[PDB]
């Protein structure tokens, strides 16, 4: 069954990435549907986002690869707007786990890219 949540990634999810302080968040302007939906979801509601980074080939200078990260459940941290323009901006807690786990410090981490899809795994 469907919850009625199917959104899009309009911008690039990136915010404070700190490990020793256990601080991982990302802010995004997401895209959604028309008005009459006052807040898709809010603080504490979980989503399921799939922002697939294909920025692998150029960053590794090789290894064309055939598997994109494929992200999963995240969490919305405030009022997420469904307006007439279908723009839903809200910041999330968490990160692309198992993929962006490499700060590297010398090897510049792969950059985030927009154009992916979003869904909702939260309940109430």
Description:
This is Gene 5 protein. It is classed as viral protein. Keywords: coat protein, insertion domain, viral protein. There is one protein chain. The protein has about 120 residues and is mainly β. It has one domain. The chain has 1 helix and 7 strands. It has a 6-stranded antiparallel barrel with strand order 1-3-6-5-4-7.
Topology overview:
Layout: E1 6-9, E2 17-18, E3 23-31, E4 46-50, H1 57-60, E5 73-76, E6 87-93, E7 117-120
Antiparallel strand pairs: 1-3, 1-7, 2-3, 3-6, 4-5, 4-7, 5-6
PDB class: viral protein
Keywords: coat protein, insertion domain, viral protein
Assembly: monomeric
What would a concise description of this structure say?
The chain has 124 residues and is mainly beta. It has 1 helix and 7 strands; from the N terminus they run ββββαβββ.
Shape category: globular
Based on CA atoms alone, the radius of gyration comes out at 15 Å
- End-to-end distance, in Å? 16 Å
| Domain module count | 1
Structural class: mainly beta
Largest sheet: 6 strands, antiparallel, barrel
Q: How many helices in DSSP terms?
A: 1
Oligomer: monomer
Order of helices and strands: EEEEHEEE
Protein name: Gene 5 protein
Any key phrases for this structure?
mainly beta; 28% strand; 6-stranded antiparallel beta barrel; 124 residues; viral protein; 3% helix; coat protein
């Amino acid at each position: 069954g469907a919850f009625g949540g199917t959104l899009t990634v309009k911008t690039q999810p990136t915010v404070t990435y700190n490990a020793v302080k256990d601080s991982y968040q990302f802010t995004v302007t997401l895209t959604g549907a028309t008005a009459s939906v006052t807040g898709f979801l809010k603080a504490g509601d979980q989503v399921k986002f799939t922002n697939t980074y294909w920025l692998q080939q150029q960053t590794k200078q090789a290894l064309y690869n055939g598997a994109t990260p494929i992200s999963f459940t995240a969490t919305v941290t405030a009022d997420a707007n469904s307006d007439s323009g279908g723009d839903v901006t809200v910041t999330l807690s968490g990160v692309p786990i198992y993929d962006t786990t490499n700060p590297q410090y010398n090897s510049v981490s792969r950059q985030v890219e927009a154009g992916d899809a979003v869904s909702v795994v939260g309940t109430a």
